[PDB]
Each structure stands twice: as C-alpha cells, then as structure tokens.
Amino acid sequence: SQWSVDDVITWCISTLEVEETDPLCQRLRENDIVGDLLPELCLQDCQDLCDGDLNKAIKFKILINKMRDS
Secondary structure (H helix, E strand, C coil): CCCCHHHHHHHHHHHHCCCCCCHHHHHHHHCCCCCCCHHHCCHHHHHHHCCCCHHHHHHHHHHHHHHHHC
C-alpha cells in the first residue's frame, strides 16, 4: 500500500467521517501507524487506536479489510 501518513489520515477522515483531531487519528499518528501497516493492526490495536471506542474500532477494522481487499 505504502501511503504517506497524511494520506492515511485522509482515508480515515473520508471513511469514518471524523476529523484529524479525532481520537482515532491522534492515536494512529502517535503510535506512528501508516496505512500500509493498517491491515496488520488487529481489533485490539484498533481499540487502542480509537482510544477505547469499540464502535469506532469495529467500523475502522471493517473498513481496513475493504481498504485492502477491495
């Protein structure tokens, strides 16, 4: 995939309809996770990534599988 972090943020915005200031984005950038890495992140990574928002985490994970496969 090899996306730049900015593009990864862009994906999250476009897909979750969240802001860059959203906790998902904060944790994602903080943990220094990149889009290419995204398929590798598990639901628990995602739970950390959303800062404990399960709804966020589940939706984001599903989007990642779509992001990769489709």
